[PDB]
Amino acid sequence: DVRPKITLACEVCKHRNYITKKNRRNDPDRLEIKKFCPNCGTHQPHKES
Amino acid sequence: GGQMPIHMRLPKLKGFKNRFRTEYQVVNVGDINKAFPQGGTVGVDELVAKGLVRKNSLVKVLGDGKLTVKVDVTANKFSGSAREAITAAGGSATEL
Amino acid sequence: SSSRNGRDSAAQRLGVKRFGGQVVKAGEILVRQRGTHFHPGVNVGRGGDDTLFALAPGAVEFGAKRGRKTVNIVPVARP
RNA sequence: GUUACGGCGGUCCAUAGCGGCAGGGAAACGCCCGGUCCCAUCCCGAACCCGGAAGCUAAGCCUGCCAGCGCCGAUGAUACUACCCAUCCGGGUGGAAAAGUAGGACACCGCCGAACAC
RNA sequence: UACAACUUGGUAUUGGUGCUCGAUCGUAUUGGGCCUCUAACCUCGGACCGUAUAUCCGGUUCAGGGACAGUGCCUGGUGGGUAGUUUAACUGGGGCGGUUGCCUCCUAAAAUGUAACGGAGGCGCCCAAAGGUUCCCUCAACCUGGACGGCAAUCAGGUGUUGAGUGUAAGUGCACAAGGGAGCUUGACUGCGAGACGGACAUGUCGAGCAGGGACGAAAGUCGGGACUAGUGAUCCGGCACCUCUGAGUGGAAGGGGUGUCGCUCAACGGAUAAAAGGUACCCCGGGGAUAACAGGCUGAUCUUCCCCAAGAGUCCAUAUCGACGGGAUGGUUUGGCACCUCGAUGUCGGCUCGUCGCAUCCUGGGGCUGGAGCAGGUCCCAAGGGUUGGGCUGUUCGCCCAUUAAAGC
RNA sequence: CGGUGCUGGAAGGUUAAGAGGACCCGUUAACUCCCUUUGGGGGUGAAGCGGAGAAUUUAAGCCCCAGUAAACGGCGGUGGUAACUAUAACCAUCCUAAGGUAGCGAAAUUCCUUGUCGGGUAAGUUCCGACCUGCACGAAUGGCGUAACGACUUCUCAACUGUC
RNA sequence: UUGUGCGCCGAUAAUGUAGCGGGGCUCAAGCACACCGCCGAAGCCGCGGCAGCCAACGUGUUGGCUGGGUAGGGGAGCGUCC
RNA sequence: CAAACUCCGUGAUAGCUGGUUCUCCCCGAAAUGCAUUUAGGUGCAGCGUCGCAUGUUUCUUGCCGGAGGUAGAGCUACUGGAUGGCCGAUGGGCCCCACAGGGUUACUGACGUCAGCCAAACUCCGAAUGCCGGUAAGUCCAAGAGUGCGGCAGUGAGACGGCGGGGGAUAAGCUCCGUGCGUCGAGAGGGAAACAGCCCAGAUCGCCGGCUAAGGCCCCUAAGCGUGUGCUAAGUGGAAAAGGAU
RNA sequence: UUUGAAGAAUGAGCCUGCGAGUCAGGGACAUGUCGCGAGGUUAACCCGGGUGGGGUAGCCGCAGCGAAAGCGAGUCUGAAUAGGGCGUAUCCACACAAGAGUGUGUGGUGUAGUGGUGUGUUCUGGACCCGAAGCGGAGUGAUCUACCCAUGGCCAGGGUGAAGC
RNA sequence: GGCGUCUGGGGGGAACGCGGGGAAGUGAAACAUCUCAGUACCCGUAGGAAGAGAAAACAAAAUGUGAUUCCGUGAGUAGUGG
Numbered sequence A: 001d002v003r004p005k006i007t008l009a010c011e012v013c014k015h016r017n018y019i020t021k022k023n024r025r026n027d028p029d030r031l032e033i034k035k036f037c038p039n040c041g042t043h044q045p046h047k048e049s
Numbered sequence B: 001g002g003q004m005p006i007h008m009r010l011p012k013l014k015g016f017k018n019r020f021r022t023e024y025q026v027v028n029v030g031d032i033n034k035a036f037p038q039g040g041t042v043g044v045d046e047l048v049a050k051g052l053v054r055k056n057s058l059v060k061v062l063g064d065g066k067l068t069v070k071v072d073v074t075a076n077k078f079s080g081s082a083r084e085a086i087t088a089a090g091g092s093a094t095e096l
Numbered sequence C: 001s002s003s004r005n006g007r008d009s010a011a012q013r014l015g016v017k018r019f020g021g022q023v024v025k026a027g028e029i030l031v032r033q034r035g036t037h038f039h040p041g042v043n044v045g046r047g048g049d050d051t052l053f054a055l056a057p058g059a060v061e062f063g064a065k066r067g068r069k070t071v072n073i074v075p076v077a078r079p
Numbered sequence D: 001g002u003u004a005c006g007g008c009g010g011u012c013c014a015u016a017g018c019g020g021c022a023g024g025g026a027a028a029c030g031c032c033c034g035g036u037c038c039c040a041u042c043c044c045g046a047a048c049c050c051g052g053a054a055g056c057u058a059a060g061c062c063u064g065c066c067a068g069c070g071c072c073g074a075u076g077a078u079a080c081u082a083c084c085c086a087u088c089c090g091g092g093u094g095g096a097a098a099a100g101u102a103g104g105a106c107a108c109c110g111c112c113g114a115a116c117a118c
Numbered sequence E: 001u002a003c004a005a006c007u008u009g010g011u012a013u014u015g016g017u018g019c020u021c022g023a024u025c026g027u028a029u030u031g032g033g034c035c036u037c038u039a040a041c042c043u044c045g046g047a048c049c050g051u052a053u054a055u056c057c058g059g060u061u062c063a064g065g066g067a068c069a070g071u072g073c074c075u076g077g078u079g080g081g082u083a084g085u086u087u088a089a090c091u092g093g094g095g096c097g098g099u100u101g102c103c104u105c106c107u108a109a110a111a112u113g114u115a116a117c118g119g120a121g122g123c124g125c126c127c128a129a130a131g132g133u134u135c136c137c138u139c140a141a142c143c144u145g146g147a148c149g150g151c152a153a154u155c156a157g158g159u160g161u162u163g164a165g166u167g168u169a170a171g172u173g174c175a176c177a178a179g180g181g182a183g184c185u186u187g188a189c190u191g192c193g194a195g196a197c198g199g200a201c202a203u204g205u206c207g208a209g210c211a212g213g214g215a216c217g218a219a220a221g222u223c224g225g226g227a228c229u230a231g232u233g234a235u236c237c238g239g240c241a242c243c244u245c246u247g248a249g250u251g252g253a254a255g256g257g258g259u260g261u262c263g264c265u266c267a268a269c270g271g272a273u274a275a276a277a278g279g280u281a282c283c284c285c286g287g288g289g290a291u292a293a294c295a296g297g298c299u300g301a302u303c304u305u306c307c308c309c310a311a312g313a314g315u316c317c318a319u320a321u322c323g324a325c326g327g328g329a330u331g332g333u334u335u336g337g338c339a340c341c342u343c344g345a346u347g348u349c350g351g352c353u354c355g356u357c358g359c360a361u362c363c364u365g366g367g368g369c370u371g372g373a374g375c376a377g378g379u380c381c382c383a384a385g386g387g388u389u390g391g392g393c394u395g396u397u398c399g400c401c402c403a404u405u406a407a408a409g410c
Numbered sequence F: 001c002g003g004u005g006c007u008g009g010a011a012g013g014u015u016a017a018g019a020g021g022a023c024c025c026g027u028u029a030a031c032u033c034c035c036u037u038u039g040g041g042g043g044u045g046a047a048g049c050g051g052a053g054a055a056u057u058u059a060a061g062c063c064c065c066a067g068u069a070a071a072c073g074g075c076g077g078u079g080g081u082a083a084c085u086a087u088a089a090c091c092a093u094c095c096u097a098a099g100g101u102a103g104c105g106a107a108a109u110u111c112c113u114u115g116u117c118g119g120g121u122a123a124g125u126u127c128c129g130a131c132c133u134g135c136a137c138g139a140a141u142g143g144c145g146u147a148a149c150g151a152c153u154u155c156u157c158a159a160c161u162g163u164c
Numbered sequence G: 001u002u003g004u005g006c007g008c009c010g011a012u013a014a015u016g017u018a019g020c021g022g023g024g025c026u027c028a029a030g031c032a033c034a035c036c037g038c039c040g041a042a043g044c045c046g047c048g049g050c051a052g053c054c055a056a057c058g059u060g061u062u063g064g065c066u067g068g069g070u071a072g073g074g075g076a077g078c079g080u081c082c
Numbered sequence H: 001c002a003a004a005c006u007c008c009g010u011g012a013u014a015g016c017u018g019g020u021u022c023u024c025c026c027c028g029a030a031a032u033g034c035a036u037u038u039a040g041g042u043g044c045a046g047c048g049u050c051g052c053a054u055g056u057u058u059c060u061u062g063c064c065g066g067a068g069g070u071a072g073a074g075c076u077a078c079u080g081g082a083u084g085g086c087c088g089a090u091g092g093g094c095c096c097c098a099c100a101g102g103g104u105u106a107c108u109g110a111c112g113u114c115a116g117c118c119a120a121a122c123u124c125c126g127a128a129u130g131c132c133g134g135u136a137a138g139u140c141c142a143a144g145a146g147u148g149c150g151g152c153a154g155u156g157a158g159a160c161g162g163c164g165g166g167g168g169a170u171a172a173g174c175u176c177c178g179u180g181c182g183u184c185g186a187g188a189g190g191g192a193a194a195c196a197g198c199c200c201a202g203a204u205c206g207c208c209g210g211c212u213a214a215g216g217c218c219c220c221u222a223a224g225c226g227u228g229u230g231c232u233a234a235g236u237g238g239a240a241a242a243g244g245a246u
Numbered sequence I: 001u002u003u004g005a006a007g008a009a010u011g012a013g014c015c016u017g018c019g020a021g022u023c024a025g026g027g028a029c030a031u032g033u034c035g036c037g038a039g040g041u042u043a044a045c046c047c048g049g050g051u052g053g054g055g056u057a058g059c060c061g062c063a064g065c066g067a068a069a070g071c072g073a074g075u076c077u078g079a080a081u082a083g084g085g086c087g088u089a090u091c092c093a094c095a096c097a098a099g100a101g102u103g104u105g106u107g108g109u110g111u112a113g114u115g116g117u118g119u120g121u122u123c124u125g126g127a128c129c130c131g132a133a134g135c136g137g138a139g140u141g142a143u144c145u146a147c148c149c150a151u152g153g154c155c156a157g158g159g160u161g162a163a164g165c
Numbered sequence J: 001g002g003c004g005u006c007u008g009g010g011g012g013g014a015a016c017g018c019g020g021g022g023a024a025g026u027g028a029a030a031c032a033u034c035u036c037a038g039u040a041c042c043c044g045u046a047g048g049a050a051g052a053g054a055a056a057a058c059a060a061a062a063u064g065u066g067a068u069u070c071c072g073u074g075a076g077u078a079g080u081g082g
């Protein structure tokens, strides 16, 4: 849809903490980022969903 | 004026109201001490005669005030504040 | 015959907002300039949108240095 | 104290820039000599970095002189305008430009550090 | 958006046999399709009876049909036949056009702000990097060409100060870079937030510092999205994940609850509903000169009538008579603009009768000049006393036509 | 015969109610580590209970194939193309289903428009008769004529008269 | 020729002069320049009265001011019936 | 009669129209913005009132610190736009194309330079104003000044005139803006004959008093048919231009 | 009513009577004012041919924060002294900081609401007064007219001359 | 079916009560859900009252209430609602 809608989840957490938009046409590979989510209290890569 | 009225363009306050409530009242430790110049124990009937709660009302209170006179307590659910107030006063505040 | 014009924008109400020699308090805004009509000085913050403010009580002071315009705050003497 | 020295600095940052002319190598400055080792070329020791001081101040820098050009700028007037006016019609007081003109003008100054002298 | 009516199936009024078709070619799956039959059911066929008379009706017999049909209930179709309704505002009268939010500039009168159907342009995104940070560095203009190769492709020598540029328009900025390249990497963090800016209000903007962790740089420090300003949507209802919220009496659970997060060109963009088009000259009501159609009024673009300079026309000669390109005025009469008077009423075109006034004069009257031989003209000046056709055509005003007069005026 | 209807054909696709029971979910006996002594605190899940819950059977209809116009309805534009002269009477274009045949036609339809021409009058924007450039006729929401009829429409003529 | 202040023509409407308000005005009662005057309002001042606000003092006087007003707000009253 | 008549729901509902009754005393609006199935309605903020509170925090001026970016001005300063000149190689090019002489040929001529304008979206310049901030004096027997909070409704149909302007044609008594503009609205008085909006000026009441503003002083009509110095012959005064005239 | 009217804009022929912000509610609030005061007050109801007495059933404030669990002069937020949001009525004097305006700790001044009565506003009621076109339910009408149904009556006189014979 | 005989009822009445049926104007600033409201109105019953009435009700561990009906509360609260 020109710009799909993507959620990001922690690994131990598994909490839909971060949400962001992308161009799926030019990025068919899933998005990887290192970030922070509060409750487990430390940085940790977030996955796509 | 037709425009979205304020009372209708704000979101409902979340959470329920928990109709089931065993609620009570606090009669200040300071007020109790002020009422006890001589002190002694404290009972539901005595505080009713003192007129600090509904006569049937069951009471949970706090230790906002200080107790210097020996005042034993006949109570149901205390607060730790008034519990230590009574203990420092050197009496008893037993919970029934 | 019909017109194709007639639309416009809002009115952001920009422009300097605390004038020279005034008394301003911490976190106070000084200007709202689209471009860099001015330039930060000691105790002045460069906002996220080219806005100017003060990071310490005092009196604002304009002044030209090197042919530009830069704002600065002189801390007024403590009574 | 002097200096025809180098860094950092100032200033409602061109009265301080540009152009032409002449001059500087004791020290410092530049250029400079070569790339094992640091490091770099989207290739190149061009840039940077590094080792050394054989050479030279041409370039750049500096200083001095030149009004060719930038540049600052009067007094005066004019434009303009706050207020008030008279039956429009423009004046009375207040404020006073821009451009142009005589002119000015080839920066000044601070702190440290280098060569001569005490 | 429904509903009346019409139409389907299942289910009930509901019975039996024979056949033929299925999932645990010789072992099993209970229902579908057909042919029959009487007995439910129908009969508006017949014949008796109530009856002395009764075409209603009830009962009896037989006869035809017959598990059909009809009827309910659920359901699907179709359904202006019937019904309740919707069908925007802005508008220089309405309607048709165009717009409806957001962004840039001008109008904007040097704080802000400030309208118009005023002048001009864009937005409903893009981006794992075009983000952060560290580091390097800066153009374009420029003369020459071992050949293609040219006016321009890449160039280096050596005046080189944005004149080049900076994701998407304009303005504001930007070389101390906001401009490129690379390296690394995620701060496009988490919870707060001193105080402010703007907001009628909901909202919207900026922001130093505090706690954990991380990023770049040895460090200094910078890092809470993109150089900024557009890229947007309230509330309800619902969906999904986590929690040390509750839990209709015991546990509980369920049931509900929070934080995070999705569903609208709801663009008529603060969104009357999940759900919407038209005529009414068959009309109707309450209102308005808040707003049109005629008139009056203000105005004079256009109109008409004057006038100014004078090239050329006119055998040569500007002005006998026309006057090119232009300019300045008058009247309020034509086409127009405004909506100030009248929508608790100002009757509209022509014709008929009747007229009355002005004069920019149609004749009659008096003059000047002629490109005035005379007659007959042309033109301009004074003059409003008087007069100023009739018919055919069309509702016509007008106009053409016929035929008169001194004329057939505006 | 495309659209909308109606009429026939239901082989296919979609879909009703009604039946239904795979998954998922709740609860609870037993338990499952250790604690006491005469089951709960650190998860499974018993049969039933119920919750949402399946797929599977489904008629008409719609989609689909034909017919139907005295059913509602339509019947074009474009270019080229002759022995003087303007034409198309022939061919090519697109597209839809076709692109107006006979008849009539500035008419009750013709806006320019008082079309042009002729008759009637001195004069005829009305009339009659023709031409066809039918803006925007047309064949059962019928075309063309039609004897007679009409307190119907238009026009002319003789008598007629104070309508003038 | 030039700069000037006044003048003139340029100049035609409709019910009746009707483009100084009129009469009239140049032997200006017009225009320009100065002066002195005088008229001219509900402006101001003069005298008397009422009321509001305010300050001082007192147990309501003194002094300063203000008093137009629609929508509308506030304060205090008159009268009628019972 | 485009859904008969009587009764009833029925006081149907009316953002619409009309009307709204005794006196005095005090203060005194707006026709704005925003939003609106909204434009002739309504609500919020400004605008008024009453009370309470802070009691000058408000106002005027002088001085001081300030930023502008308008009028104007300017342009070899840029974006644009413009006229006339200069060498003009090289029209960055032509009569013979030689690979070499001339528009030996009137062209084009770029750049730049000499000068002269113009611009709301041009500014290498740049005010009087207006605004915000600080200080000080003054009205300080109070304006009845400000700000906050609280009860109360109006109003969101403006007009005109002067200023700066857009549109219109520099027309409208036109429309749309700005004026810590003015006035009417919501204002009586005098002047311009008449005339809200133009000029002068704020009506507590009464007085058969006086001084004055605008405008006037021959009569209607109160005031000099005044003083002195000049102009005009046109009733100009007491409607008008381009142009013309011993 | 209007920006604006002598208005040629509306309404009034005249007089006299009648005619328009009322009324109810433990309704809500604010202002006056009245009683009591950390308290204030009662409804319905019972009994006095009389407004008395009884009746504390109930409601408001005394404490708020949090959506809720819950906490409590704090509380919510949050991993958090780490300040912020909301209250602790409100202030005076002492010390600690920056003097980021004020915050943080002590000793006193100690909290004022409630029920009448009258008033403006809001509230639901028809809610300041009159007024509509119209929608719906129940009934009354075909003595005019429309149609039709059954039974009667009406059509002077004078011409034209089909079929048939 | 047909007779004949005893006993009942038949209609009227203002409201109230029960029961069968049952709408729109209006508000929602429109409007369908919704509201108006089970109101008006129609109809059949009885009575002086009717109707309801002896829990298959609530409650919540108290070893509680104890038929129906009507008041004032509880409370415009829990909730329901484009």
Ligand SMILES: [Mg+2]
Binding pocket: A017, A018
């Ligand atoms: Mg998040």
Ligand SMILES: [Mg+2]
Binding pocket: C009, C010, C011
């Ligand atoms: Mg803008």
Ligand SMILES: [Mg+2]
Binding pocket: none
């Ligand atoms: Mg040396």
Ligand SMILES: [Mg+2]
Binding pocket: D045
């Ligand atoms: Mg090298």
Ligand SMILES: [Mg+2]
Binding pocket: D058
């Ligand atoms: Mg050299």
Ligand SMILES: [Mg+2]
Binding pocket: D059, D060
């Ligand atoms: Mg050099």
Ligand SMILES: [Mg+2]
Binding pocket: D071
């Ligand atoms: Mg210069």
Ligand SMILES: [Mg+2]
Binding pocket: D014, D017, D070, D071
């Ligand atoms: Mg210089």
Ligand SMILES: [Mg+2]
Binding pocket: D075
């Ligand atoms: Mg000077």
Ligand SMILES: [Mg+2]
Binding pocket: D084, D085
């Ligand atoms: Mg003045």
Ligand SMILES: [Mg+2]
Binding pocket: D088, D089
């Ligand atoms: Mg004048």
Ligand SMILES: [Mg+2]
Binding pocket: none
């Ligand atoms: Mg100067």
Ligand SMILES: [Mg+2]
Binding pocket: E010, E011
């Ligand atoms: Mg069935």
Ligand SMILES: [Mg+2]
Binding pocket: E014
């Ligand atoms: Mg069956």
Ligand SMILES: [Mg+2]
Binding pocket: none
């Ligand atoms: Mg339908």
Ligand SMILES: [Mg+2]
Binding pocket: none
């Ligand atoms: Mg209909």
